[PDB]
């Protein structure tokens, strides 16, 4: 009975670890893609202004 309970607990723990790792990797990849697209959109929104500032710092 102890060996059967140990085998069942190990299999259930491995299954729960695999499912939780899949869910956490999916949530991390979703947040990564969302934050990357949002940062690209925000940088494009803040763009075209300081380029002339860096050019005036560059041009004499």
């Amino acid at each position: 009975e102890a060996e059967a309970k140990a085998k069942a607990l190990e299999a259930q723990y491995r299954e729960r670890e695999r499912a939780e790792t899949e869910a956490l990797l999916a949530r991390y990849r979703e947040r990564a893609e969302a934050e990357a697209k949002a940062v690209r959109e925000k940088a494009m929104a803040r763009l075209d202004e300081a380029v002339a500032l860096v050019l005036k710092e560059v041009l004499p």
């Binding site: 102890a2 723990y13 670890e17 990797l25 991390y28």
Partner: protein
């Protein structure tokens, strides 16, 4: 006859002592087996939970 009867009474007392010793040995053996199985199951479940926690930590870091 009286000495054989006294030796038979002592043999019955020894048989009762042997049955009591066998019962006490079986009880102590069952107690030790239950304690060993409880400690082993607790160690295995705690090891599975700790491995799951460490793997979840490394996966969240990744």
């Amino acid at each position: 006859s009286k000495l054989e009867a006294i030796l038979s009474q002592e043999v019955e007392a020894e048989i009762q002592a042997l049955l009591q010793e066998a019962e006490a040995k079986a009880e102590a053996v069952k107690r030790e087996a239950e304690e060993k199985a409880k400690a082993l199951l607790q160690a295995r479940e705690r090891a599975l939970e700790a491995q799951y926690r460490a793997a979840l930590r490394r996966a969240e870091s990744a």
